[PDB]
Amino acid sequence: QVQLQESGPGILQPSQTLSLTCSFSGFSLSTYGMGVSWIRQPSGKGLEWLAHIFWDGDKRYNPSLKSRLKISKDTSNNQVFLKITSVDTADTATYYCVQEGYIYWGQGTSVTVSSAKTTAPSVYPLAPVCGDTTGSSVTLGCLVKGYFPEPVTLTWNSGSLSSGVHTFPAVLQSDLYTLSSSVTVTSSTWPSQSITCNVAHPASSTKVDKKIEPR
């Protein structure tokens, strides 16, 4: 009932070739008028159309991108394919498989092009410097920096501190990611109660628990 499942690599080094696949069930690419599109949405920006293959084998490409793209079908396996050569960092995006170019969207598959290797993060406490103030609320932080690949899982006090927490999105600074979280509690709470930053980076199998201690 139109299932579209895109499958691809995860991380790929610059200058390789990206081979993506789309498995559809629920229609057939021989229906007059049918065709499947790949659209990508690069990190945080909006959607970009890449290609479209028609029921009749007529292929249409994105002008800018043309030179790097090759769509394909294999109707006996219910697979549309896309290939982009010479990937560069801009190709980190999520690739989507789309019926007719708009009506049934697949799930997406993230490809990430990097030269970084698995780097486990540095977790640093961010304690205040002192003057009981701001509703006599204190804000404490956790900086998790220089890791690859995404994600990490930051919780406070094992998921027990939940209001006041603000985990900010990861940003790239020199092929590696940095993240931070702030938790604001009242003066009654820290340092009377201990507050711990718990970071887990599954890709390097690292778990770190730092206790925020007055400085």
Binding site: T134, H166, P169, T178, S182
Partner: protein, 215 residues
């Protein structure tokens, strides 16, 4: 290339008012009768949820309060009543002529009271400095509207190099924003400066909020 010009870029609305977003094509998107303009709703982290296709056709399951209007160049999506949910980004895409193009997005945010940023600044942990780097972090928190600008001064000069900013999305509870800004220096620059200042400028204040420290 049928450019689409979506507007407004941002819509602040409250629970109940009708929201109306407009998408505008360079040229006709109709093959006279069919209008190939589709509207997408994307919450952060979601895939595109197609809402309405070929100008006025609600997808099976989109809550009816979403109307689609328009023809040839001018088109409209009218969310009405805007509910809590509907805060997301709205896209419009023409598919009447390859390449398929998308409107730039319109982010609809729930409106609320002005709140000014709780700013907190944090010097480098010991750990980092042992490791040879120094990051100074400033968290500007819980503020409405979204528009803020942060400036770092080290011994009164505007340092605008080595700065990483990151914003959270609009909070579901109080409908506020927060961002984080981190200035990264080597251990050596860090130690030949005394005062670090995080200065923010938000609609709520006359002139800036500043947090600073001396080593």
């Amino acid at each position: 290339d049928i450019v689409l010009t979506q507007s407004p870029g941002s819509l602040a609305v409250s629970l109940g008012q009708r929201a109306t977003i407009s998408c505008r094509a360079s040229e006709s998107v109709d093959d006279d009768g069919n209008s190939f303009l589709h509207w997408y709703q994307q919450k952060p982290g979601q895939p595109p949820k197609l809402l309405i296709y070929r100008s006025s056709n609600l997808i099976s399951g989109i809550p009816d309060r979403f109307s689609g209007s328009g023809s040839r160049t001018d088109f409209t999506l009218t969310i009405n009543p805007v509910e809590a949910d509907d805060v997301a980004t709205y896209y419009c895409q023409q598919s009447n002529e390859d390449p398929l193009t998308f409107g730039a997005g319109t982010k609809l945010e729930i409106k609320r009271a002005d709140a000014a940023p709780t700013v907190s600044i944090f010097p480098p942990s010991s750990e980092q400095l042992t490791s040879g780097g120094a990051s100074v972090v400033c968290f500007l928190n819980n503020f409405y509207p979204k528009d803020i600008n942060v400036k770092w001064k080290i011994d009164g000069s505007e340092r605008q190099n080595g700065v990483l900013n990151s914003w959270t999305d609009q909070d579901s509870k109080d409908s506020t924003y927060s961002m984080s800004s981190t200035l990264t220096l080597t251990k050596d620059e860090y130690e030949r400066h005394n005062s670090y200042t995080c200065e923010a400028t938000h609609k709520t204040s006359t002139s800036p909020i500043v947090k600073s420290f001396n080593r």
